[PDB]
Amino acid sequence: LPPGWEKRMGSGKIEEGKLVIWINGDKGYNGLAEVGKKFEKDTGIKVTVEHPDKLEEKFPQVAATGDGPDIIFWAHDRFGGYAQSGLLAEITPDKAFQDKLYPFTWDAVRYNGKLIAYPIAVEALSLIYNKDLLPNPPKTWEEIPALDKELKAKGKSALMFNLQEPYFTWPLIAADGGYAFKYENGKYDIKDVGVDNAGAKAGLTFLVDLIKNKHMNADTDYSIAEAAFNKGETAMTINGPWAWSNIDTSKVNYGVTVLPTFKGQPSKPFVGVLSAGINAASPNKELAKEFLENYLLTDEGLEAVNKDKPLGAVALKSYEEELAKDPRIAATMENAQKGEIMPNIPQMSAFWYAVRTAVINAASGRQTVDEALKDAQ
Ligand SMILES: OC[C@H]1O[C@H](O[C@H]2[C@H](O)[C@@H](O)[C@@H](O)O[C@@H]2CO)[C@H](O)[C@@H](O)[C@@H]1O
């Protein structure tokens, strides 16, 4: 199980009197660092924002040995698993603080009756399109192939998104009836990975058909997708609010809109709530609580992070109402509403690993759409 246990053995594990915060590379870590500086000026407490690669997997490795950051940022879906491993301190906001956030966001970070993290923003994938190449985006997945060959004559592609992470292809898979775990009447039934049904099958086959007919390459990743769109080579892409910042600086005239339908049914992106949890091994819990409640989760705090990279629909009511006017955010919520909030059950990491492989192989010439979808059942 453990990696890197030997190195840190005698090094003072999590430093006292300091704050170490981890957050994914695609998020506004400089904006967060600004809140840190505001925190440093008021308290003398030094804040250090880092963005390690493979964050979602590096944290459970180091935290299991009493290591890592005081504060861990990630979508809520992996927090129940962190909680079951005893990596998270329980958080104690009072009622007056909880009322400042949307109740549905606290539910996303509630595991076994306990609040295990602070909600920050609601994330959902949307269709992002180049208006100069495509003033009106297609409403259906089915009209993409015809659109793509049309654009091919001009040396442009129709659609390019990250095919390595199942997060980006999940809304296709779930549009017709695919699902992770049955949620019947309050609690999830793990004994039916609904990733096997016809609805799921029909979704991935189309993606596989899109690569069979050369409309998409199966080796396309986040960096390749972002580059093709931001330079102006592809007309559409699929991404979250965090990506808007790099697109903004590329001067592609872009719009953010509802994901394409499939079989007359909307794509259902897996909705993620960006959350901040406190390491169980942190000797700075009160400092972390003070930082999170009175510095980050304020209008000034969220604005700083947002200006760097858009968080989407923030969990804090007061700062939200100022953002709702942004149609890109409206589009995010529209897609979120058509999708479903990810569960936080510990099985999710297992789910994600399976589907990921189940998607890569089926999209490639290594396994079929069943030697991958049964391989993940
Ligand atoms: O691809 C599986 C992956 O999906 C989600 O990860 C998202 C994350 O929520 C977003 O904030 C953004 O960083 O894109 C990620 C996909 O690369 C799940 O949250 C994650 O647990 C899961 O592994």
Author numbering: 4 to 380
Q: How do the authors describe this structure?
A:
In order to reveal the atomic-level details of co-translational folding, we determined the structures of a series of nascent model peptide with increasing amino acid length. For this study, we chose the human Pin1 Trp-Trp domain (WW domain), which consists of 35 residues, as our model peptide. The topology of the WW domain composed of three strands and two beta-hairpins, which form an antiparallel beta-sheet. The structures of the intermediate-length (WW11-MBP, WW17-MBP, WW19-MBP) and full-length (WW35-MBP) WW domains, which are fused with MBP at their C-termini, were determined with X-ray crystallography.
In this study, we prepared WWX, where the X-residue N-terminal WW domain fragments is denoted using the format WWX. WW11, WW17, and WW19 take an alpha-helical conformation. In order to assess the crystal packing effect, three independent structures of WW11 in two crystal forms were compared. In addition, the WW11 in Form II can be superimposed onto that in chain A of Form I with an RMSD of 1.65 Å. This indicates that there is little or no packing effect for the structures of the WW domain fragments.
